[PDB]
Amino acid sequence: PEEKFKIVRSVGEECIQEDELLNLLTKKPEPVCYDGFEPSGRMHIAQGVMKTISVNKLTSAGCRVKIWIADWFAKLNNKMGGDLKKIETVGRYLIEIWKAVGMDVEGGKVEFLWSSKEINARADEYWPLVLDIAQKNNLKRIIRCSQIMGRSEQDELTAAQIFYPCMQCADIFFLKADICQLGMDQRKVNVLAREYCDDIKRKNKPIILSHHMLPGLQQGQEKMSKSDPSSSVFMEDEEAEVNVKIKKAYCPPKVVEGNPCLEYIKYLILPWFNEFTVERSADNGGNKTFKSYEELIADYESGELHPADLKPALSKSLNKILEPVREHFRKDSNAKELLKRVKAYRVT
Amino acid sequence: PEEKFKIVRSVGEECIQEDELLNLLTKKPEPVCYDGFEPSGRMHIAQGVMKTISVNKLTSAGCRVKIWIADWFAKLNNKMGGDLKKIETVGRYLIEIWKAVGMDVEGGKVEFLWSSKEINARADEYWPLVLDIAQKNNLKRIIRCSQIMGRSEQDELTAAQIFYPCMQCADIFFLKADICQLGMDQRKVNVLAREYCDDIKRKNKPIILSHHMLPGLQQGQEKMSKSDPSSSVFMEDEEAEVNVKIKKAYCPPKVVEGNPCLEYIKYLILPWFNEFTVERSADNGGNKTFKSYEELIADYESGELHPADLKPALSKSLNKILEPVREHFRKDSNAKELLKRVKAYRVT
RNA sequence: CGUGGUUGACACGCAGACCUCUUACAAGAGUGUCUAGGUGCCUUUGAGAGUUACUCUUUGCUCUCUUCGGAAGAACCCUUAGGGGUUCGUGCAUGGGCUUGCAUAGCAAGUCUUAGAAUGCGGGUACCGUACAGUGUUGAAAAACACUGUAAAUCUCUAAAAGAGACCA
């Protein structure tokens, strides 16, 4: 009904043709949305938790979700070298993260799909699609759509940088994915898919749900920073590491925009616990719970929410979120082996 | 061994790593030979005659020639609108030409492999190799490999132009190919495959055996252009068409450099009949048979051989060469339908 | 290509095209044949998102609603069908006088006739004619008739371009 649109649209901060989203929800009972991941080692906090809450919201409406875990795409991005077995291991690490935190696996309605497996299974239907998308486009469009890897950087042009966007755009139609829920970076390949769908004269163009970019822990880079372990926070970071990283995290008081701590709160813990408690002394306002981001930012502007006590509360909340994962690795031996391997590898 | 090297080197104008070719013949008694064709437009006299004599000499010397029908590749070049069905009909019509002319298919040493029936059968180890050749190369090197499609760097780029060289360089290894016969048009791909073998430290570097492509029948055209059917001879042309084309051909008196007729003779008739019988009247020397190119070129430089009689003899020889194709097309209703379907298609 | 002349042709010369020869296309010559079109009708509504990307202006491109409908028309379905429904299939500028710049009546400043379709050019469109491609029939070759198309068939075949500031106009 209207509830499906009212909860689905909340997942993506920006969407195009939301009327098409409503039409899709009304026409189809089980829409299919995907998510693309390059297994670049240890998991980012954004992909870990923001994606988890987003997919929980989407499956609350019953929308089918497919995990488009992308190994050959990681090879194109040249993450952890050109090797494939290590990429497969870190990919199954990501799957174990999904199961350990608890995402939707209890229902089994989600689908973890390896790019290699699905592409090889239906190559005759996938690769001709890739070639068609390539033919319908030129180098200028694909080079424009290069930020999806993040390797554009006004750097040396690469053939992988050209095979990437077409190959990703093929995934949308290959998975019969009618809902695209990805980061702001993937919006370029989503727009490319829309243009190609217009060119192929096929209606029901897939809708895009671009959720907000999660800032790094420190000022200097608004987008994701997976090249600096200090600048981001990960799932296998221990309690002491998480706490010290958040204490070192940038957080200027009397600031609304550009504060990574507030963004982490709003996009991670408020949708998770449906609330947020801040512990303070009897002279600083005492322990207080918050139910909305608006009141939290209003009190932060008021100054009663000092960062010096906000960051410990944020650390406690994130530790509460991530402790089921850590307990899962101390119970599962396979999880222990995977963590040992993925910690052994170095990001290159 | 030595005779095999002599025969195989006799067909290619340029041969890189001749010693490696000799070693390959010494070890492998039936080295595999690769040559590709995008089924686009109508067969030129080159791909019909030089390829026929090349395959004949290679099989007689002992080889296993793997010929490629590039159906998907033609779709990338935007040939005949990219319809796979239109490309397929042109492929089986080409196969009919090749069987008519004298391909030694009876020995079983020639296999007509179509890209679609082969890539779909093995895409789990072909496409990943395409991704590998993608990563190992940068975009600028691929752009330098643009003479392959006939698109100059001034001409607007296209993602098909980046997909194409990567897939065919991948073909050079996917077919387990050892020999590439394709002429100066494919030299960029040849050297790129060699440099990739250097990058992937391959121990079997493929040999380059580029043919000499015929100069166009116009002024300054070093290769025939199918976009202008008046500058090339086609395999299915009728005796009147061949005769008028040769009559309108260019052949300056007592000049060898850039003479299309001399190249036609050298690469088509002398390798075919082991001679070139020219019938002349008693006023200018009477009938004369040439057993080698050297005597013919010496006579031409002397001026005693006049193009006025050279051209009709060339026309008669070409008609004798091409009459099996016409007979095969006329005798078979299926061949007739294929021929009329091919001509029906317009030049793109 | 006109004139004696029915589009087209024929007397006549030339124009172009096709063919042959001197075979190098070039340059010239030869005796040949052909050239095509006509008719009738429509064609200016806006907004919106994406699209150079760093924005803004001029825009161009698809693009979904909406429209005095992207029409005159083509395709299909219902089909007692007189009719109805769906899809494809759309043009760009200028104008003429009223008050002024101007001697009130060129061009511009305020409206104007959805477009006087008013003015020119252009899109496809339906029909006829000619020839050709192909098919069948009447067929002794030849020829005649009917039908499907061609003539008027292809460059952002790959939608982004210009400018002005910012960091790159």
PDB file of C-alpha atoms in Angstrom, chain B residues 134-303:
ATOM      1  CA  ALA B 134      41.943  -5.421 -19.309  1.00  0.00           C
ATOM      2  CA  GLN B 135      43.729  -4.942 -15.996  1.00  0.00           C
ATOM      3  CA  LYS B 136      47.226  -5.501 -17.379  1.00  0.00           C
ATOM      4  CA  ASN B 137      46.681  -2.764 -19.988  1.00  0.00           C
ATOM      5  CA  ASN B 138      45.999   0.959 -19.745  1.00  0.00           C
ATOM      6  CA  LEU B 139      43.527   2.855 -21.898  1.00  0.00           C
ATOM      7  CA  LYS B 140      46.086   4.776 -23.959  1.00  0.00           C
ATOM      8  CA  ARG B 141      47.724   1.568 -25.182  1.00  0.00           C
ATOM      9  CA  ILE B 142      44.317   0.273 -26.299  1.00  0.00           C
ATOM     10  CA  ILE B 143      43.630   3.556 -28.103  1.00  0.00           C
ATOM     11  CA  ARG B 144      46.956   3.153 -29.905  1.00  0.00           C
ATOM     12  CA  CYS B 145      45.357  -0.120 -31.040  1.00  0.00           C
ATOM     13  CA  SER B 146      42.736   1.703 -33.105  1.00  0.00           C
ATOM     14  CA  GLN B 147      44.043   0.977 -36.620  1.00  0.00           C
ATOM     15  CA  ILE B 148      42.555  -2.469 -35.946  1.00  0.00           C
ATOM     16  CA  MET B 149      38.993  -1.230 -36.489  1.00  0.00           C
ATOM     17  CA  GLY B 150      39.975   1.316 -39.127  1.00  0.00           C
ATOM     18  CA  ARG B 151      38.962   4.114 -36.748  1.00  0.00           C
ATOM     19  CA  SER B 152      41.569   6.852 -36.535  1.00  0.00           C
ATOM     20  CA  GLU B 153      42.124   8.591 -33.213  1.00  0.00           C
ATOM     21  CA  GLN B 154      40.513  11.683 -34.753  1.00  0.00           C
ATOM     22  CA  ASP B 155      37.299   9.684 -35.157  1.00  0.00           C
ATOM     23  CA  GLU B 156      35.022   9.624 -32.129  1.00  0.00           C
ATOM     24  CA  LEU B 157      35.724   6.831 -29.657  1.00  0.00           C
ATOM     25  CA  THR B 158      33.324   4.080 -28.590  1.00  0.00           C
ATOM     26  CA  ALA B 159      33.274   1.492 -25.815  1.00  0.00           C
ATOM     27  CA  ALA B 160      33.015  -1.170 -28.513  1.00  0.00           C
ATOM     28  CA  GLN B 161      36.446   0.039 -29.638  1.00  0.00           C
ATOM     29  CA  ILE B 162      37.834  -0.812 -26.190  1.00  0.00           C
ATOM     30  CA  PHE B 163      36.010  -4.137 -25.898  1.00  0.00           C
ATOM     31  CA  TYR B 164      37.076  -5.311 -29.377  1.00  0.00           C
ATOM     32  CA  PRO B 165      40.902  -5.455 -29.116  1.00  0.00           C
ATOM     33  CA  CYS B 166      40.722  -6.920 -25.623  1.00  0.00           C
ATOM     34  CA  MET B 167      38.433  -9.764 -26.690  1.00  0.00           C
ATOM     35  CA  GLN B 168      40.476 -10.586 -29.773  1.00  0.00           C
ATOM     36  CA  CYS B 169      43.805 -10.433 -27.928  1.00  0.00           C
ATOM     37  CA  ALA B 170      42.080 -12.775 -25.493  1.00  0.00           C
ATOM     38  CA  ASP B 171      41.133 -14.941 -28.479  1.00  0.00           C
ATOM     39  CA  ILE B 172      44.799 -15.248 -29.437  1.00  0.00           C
ATOM     40  CA  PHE B 173      45.246 -17.278 -26.225  1.00  0.00           C
ATOM     41  CA  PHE B 174      41.740 -18.702 -25.729  1.00  0.00           C
ATOM     42  CA  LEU B 175      42.033 -20.658 -28.972  1.00  0.00           C
ATOM     43  CA  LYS B 176      45.443 -21.731 -27.604  1.00  0.00           C
ATOM     44  CA  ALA B 177      46.613 -20.156 -30.841  1.00  0.00           C
ATOM     45  CA  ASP B 178      50.272 -20.195 -31.872  1.00  0.00           C
ATOM     46  CA  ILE B 179      50.136 -18.438 -35.258  1.00  0.00           C
ATOM     47  CA  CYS B 180      48.380 -15.229 -36.297  1.00  0.00           C
ATOM     48  CA  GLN B 181      48.106 -14.715 -40.061  1.00  0.00           C
ATOM     49  CA  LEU B 182      46.138 -11.461 -40.027  1.00  0.00           C
ATOM     50  CA  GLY B 183      47.845  -8.661 -41.911  1.00  0.00           C
ATOM     51  CA  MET B 184      49.045  -5.180 -41.002  1.00  0.00           C
ATOM     52  CA  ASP B 185      45.550  -4.376 -39.724  1.00  0.00           C
ATOM     53  CA  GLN B 186      46.056  -6.715 -36.740  1.00  0.00           C
ATOM     54  CA  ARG B 187      49.698  -5.864 -36.005  1.00  0.00           C
ATOM     55  CA  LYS B 188      48.740  -3.684 -33.037  1.00  0.00           C
ATOM     56  CA  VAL B 189      46.828  -6.589 -31.497  1.00  0.00           C
ATOM     57  CA  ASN B 190      49.728  -8.912 -32.294  1.00  0.00           C
ATOM     58  CA  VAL B 191      52.324  -6.814 -30.478  1.00  0.00           C
ATOM     59  CA  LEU B 192      49.873  -6.172 -27.632  1.00  0.00           C
ATOM     60  CA  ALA B 193      49.397  -9.918 -27.169  1.00  0.00           C
ATOM     61  CA  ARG B 194      53.172 -10.379 -27.197  1.00  0.00           C
ATOM     62  CA  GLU B 195      53.657  -7.686 -24.554  1.00  0.00           C
ATOM     63  CA  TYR B 196      50.912  -9.282 -22.455  1.00  0.00           C
ATOM     64  CA  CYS B 197      52.688 -12.635 -22.684  1.00  0.00           C
ATOM     65  CA  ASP B 198      55.685 -10.704 -21.386  1.00  0.00           C
ATOM     66  CA  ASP B 199      53.524  -9.330 -18.559  1.00  0.00           C
ATOM     67  CA  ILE B 200      51.959 -12.711 -17.737  1.00  0.00           C
ATOM     68  CA  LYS B 201      55.385 -14.358 -18.254  1.00  0.00           C
ATOM     69  CA  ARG B 202      53.944 -16.783 -20.797  1.00  0.00           C
ATOM     70  CA  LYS B 203      56.472 -19.284 -22.143  1.00  0.00           C
ATOM     71  CA  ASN B 204      54.736 -19.687 -25.540  1.00  0.00           C
ATOM     72  CA  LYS B 205      54.704 -16.305 -27.281  1.00  0.00           C
ATOM     73  CA  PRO B 206      52.498 -16.386 -30.406  1.00  0.00           C
ATOM     74  CA  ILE B 207      54.123 -15.801 -33.785  1.00  0.00           C
ATOM     75  CA  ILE B 208      53.102 -12.865 -35.991  1.00  0.00           C
ATOM     76  CA  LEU B 209      52.568 -13.675 -39.688  1.00  0.00           C
ATOM     77  CA  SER B 210      50.811 -10.605 -41.065  1.00  0.00           C
ATOM     78  CA  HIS B 211      49.864 -10.784 -44.737  1.00  0.00           C
ATOM     79  CA  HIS B 212      50.261  -7.962 -47.199  1.00  0.00           C
ATOM     80  CA  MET B 213      46.907  -6.304 -47.810  1.00  0.00           C
ATOM     81  CA  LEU B 214      46.227  -5.297 -51.410  1.00  0.00           C
ATOM     82  CA  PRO B 215      46.346  -1.603 -52.303  1.00  0.00           C
ATOM     83  CA  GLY B 216      43.036  -0.142 -53.365  1.00  0.00           C
ATOM     84  CA  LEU B 217      42.155   0.158 -57.018  1.00  0.00           C
ATOM     85  CA  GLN B 218      42.131   3.963 -56.613  1.00  0.00           C
ATOM     86  CA  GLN B 219      45.018   6.380 -56.095  1.00  0.00           C
ATOM     87  CA  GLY B 220      46.866   6.176 -52.788  1.00  0.00           C
ATOM     88  CA  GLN B 221      44.585   3.516 -51.267  1.00  0.00           C
ATOM     89  CA  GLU B 222      46.908   1.027 -49.575  1.00  0.00           C
ATOM     90  CA  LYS B 223      43.936  -1.177 -48.603  1.00  0.00           C
ATOM     91  CA  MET B 224      40.617  -1.801 -50.320  1.00  0.00           C
ATOM     92  CA  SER B 225      37.568  -0.016 -48.890  1.00  0.00           C
ATOM     93  CA  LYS B 226      34.294  -1.947 -48.869  1.00  0.00           C
ATOM     94  CA  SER B 227      32.499   1.399 -48.496  1.00  0.00           C
ATOM     95  CA  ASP B 228      33.336   1.995 -52.184  1.00  0.00           C
ATOM     96  CA  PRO B 229      32.510  -1.185 -54.155  1.00  0.00           C
ATOM     97  CA  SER B 230      34.243   0.224 -57.260  1.00  0.00           C
ATOM     98  CA  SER B 231      37.677  -0.063 -55.597  1.00  0.00           C
ATOM     99  CA  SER B 232      37.553  -3.778 -54.715  1.00  0.00           C
ATOM    100  CA  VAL B 233      36.781  -7.136 -56.383  1.00  0.00           C
ATOM    101  CA  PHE B 234      34.205  -9.374 -54.626  1.00  0.00           C
ATOM    102  CA  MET B 235      34.236 -13.212 -54.587  1.00  0.00           C
ATOM    103  CA  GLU B 236      30.685 -13.601 -56.028  1.00  0.00           C
ATOM    104  CA  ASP B 237      31.053 -10.943 -58.793  1.00  0.00           C
ATOM    105  CA  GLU B 238      30.103 -12.188 -62.313  1.00  0.00           C
ATOM    106  CA  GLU B 239      32.580 -12.478 -65.176  1.00  0.00           C
ATOM    107  CA  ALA B 240      31.410  -9.170 -66.636  1.00  0.00           C
ATOM    108  CA  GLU B 241      31.793  -7.462 -63.254  1.00  0.00           C
ATOM    109  CA  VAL B 242      35.313  -8.810 -62.707  1.00  0.00           C
ATOM    110  CA  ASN B 243      36.320  -7.916 -66.265  1.00  0.00           C
ATOM    111  CA  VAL B 244      35.031  -4.341 -66.033  1.00  0.00           C
ATOM    112  CA  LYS B 245      36.620  -3.878 -62.602  1.00  0.00           C
ATOM    113  CA  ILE B 246      40.007  -5.021 -63.906  1.00  0.00           C
ATOM    114  CA  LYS B 247      39.548  -2.924 -67.052  1.00  0.00           C
ATOM    115  CA  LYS B 248      38.962   0.132 -64.854  1.00  0.00           C
ATOM    116  CA  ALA B 249      41.855  -0.936 -62.615  1.00  0.00           C
ATOM    117  CA  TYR B 250      44.999   1.131 -62.156  1.00  0.00           C
ATOM    118  CA  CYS B 251      48.336  -0.056 -63.530  1.00  0.00           C
ATOM    119  CA  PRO B 252      50.793   2.631 -64.688  1.00  0.00           C
ATOM    120  CA  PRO B 253      53.176   1.504 -67.445  1.00  0.00           C
ATOM    121  CA  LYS B 254      56.704   0.523 -66.386  1.00  0.00           C
ATOM    122  CA  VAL B 255      55.927   1.327 -62.729  1.00  0.00           C
ATOM    123  CA  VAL B 256      55.947  -1.226 -59.909  1.00  0.00           C
ATOM    124  CA  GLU B 257      55.652   0.767 -56.675  1.00  0.00           C
ATOM    125  CA  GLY B 258      51.987   1.089 -55.754  1.00  0.00           C
ATOM    126  CA  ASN B 259      50.681  -0.891 -58.727  1.00  0.00           C
ATOM    127  CA  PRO B 260      47.493  -2.724 -57.662  1.00  0.00           C
ATOM    128  CA  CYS B 261      47.580  -5.119 -60.619  1.00  0.00           C
ATOM    129  CA  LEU B 262      51.104  -6.320 -59.834  1.00  0.00           C
ATOM    130  CA  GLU B 263      50.154  -7.035 -56.216  1.00  0.00           C
ATOM    131  CA  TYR B 264      47.019  -8.816 -57.426  1.00  0.00           C
ATOM    132  CA  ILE B 265      49.137 -11.042 -59.662  1.00  0.00           C
ATOM    133  CA  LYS B 266      51.843 -11.682 -57.067  1.00  0.00           C
ATOM    134  CA  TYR B 267      49.523 -12.565 -54.183  1.00  0.00           C
ATOM    135  CA  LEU B 268      46.771 -14.336 -56.099  1.00  0.00           C
ATOM    136  CA  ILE B 269      47.715 -15.954 -59.417  1.00  0.00           C
ATOM    137  CA  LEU B 270      51.351 -17.006 -59.064  1.00  0.00           C
ATOM    138  CA  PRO B 271      50.598 -18.727 -55.713  1.00  0.00           C
ATOM    139  CA  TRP B 272      47.563 -20.386 -57.314  1.00  0.00           C
ATOM    140  CA  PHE B 273      48.572 -21.679 -60.754  1.00  0.00           C
ATOM    141  CA  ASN B 274      52.332 -21.652 -60.000  1.00  0.00           C
ATOM    142  CA  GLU B 275      52.444 -19.547 -63.185  1.00  0.00           C
ATOM    143  CA  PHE B 276      50.677 -16.699 -64.988  1.00  0.00           C
ATOM    144  CA  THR B 277      49.941 -17.480 -68.634  1.00  0.00           C
ATOM    145  CA  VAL B 278      49.398 -14.292 -70.644  1.00  0.00           C
ATOM    146  CA  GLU B 279      48.028 -14.707 -74.172  1.00  0.00           C
ATOM    147  CA  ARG B 280      49.376 -12.027 -76.509  1.00  0.00           C
ATOM    148  CA  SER B 281      49.381 -11.416 -80.245  1.00  0.00           C
ATOM    149  CA  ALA B 282      52.453 -11.859 -82.435  1.00  0.00           C
ATOM    150  CA  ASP B 283      52.855  -8.081 -82.838  1.00  0.00           C
ATOM    151  CA  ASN B 284      54.131  -7.708 -79.256  1.00  0.00           C
ATOM    152  CA  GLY B 285      55.816 -11.055 -78.498  1.00  0.00           C
ATOM    153  CA  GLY B 286      53.069 -13.659 -78.859  1.00  0.00           C
ATOM    154  CA  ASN B 287      51.978 -15.999 -76.105  1.00  0.00           C
ATOM    155  CA  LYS B 288      54.233 -16.203 -73.057  1.00  0.00           C
ATOM    156  CA  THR B 289      54.091 -18.110 -69.771  1.00  0.00           C
ATOM    157  CA  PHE B 290      55.615 -16.669 -66.596  1.00  0.00           C
ATOM    158  CA  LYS B 291      56.825 -19.155 -63.983  1.00  0.00           C
ATOM    159  CA  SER B 292      57.926 -16.518 -61.454  1.00  0.00           C
ATOM    160  CA  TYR B 293      57.285 -12.956 -60.341  1.00  0.00           C
ATOM    161  CA  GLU B 294      60.865 -11.870 -61.080  1.00  0.00           C
ATOM    162  CA  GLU B 295      60.623 -12.468 -64.829  1.00  0.00           C
ATOM    163  CA  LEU B 296      57.255 -10.687 -64.934  1.00  0.00           C
ATOM    164  CA  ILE B 297      58.545  -7.636 -63.064  1.00  0.00           C
ATOM    165  CA  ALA B 298      61.671  -7.554 -65.240  1.00  0.00           C
ATOM    166  CA  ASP B 299      59.498  -7.619 -68.364  1.00  0.00           C
ATOM    167  CA  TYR B 300      57.267  -4.883 -66.934  1.00  0.00           C
ATOM    168  CA  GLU B 301      60.278  -2.678 -66.186  1.00  0.00           C
ATOM    169  CA  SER B 302      61.549  -3.394 -69.701  1.00  0.00           C
ATOM    170  CA  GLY B 303      58.197  -2.244 -71.099  1.00  0.00           C
TER     171      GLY B 303
END
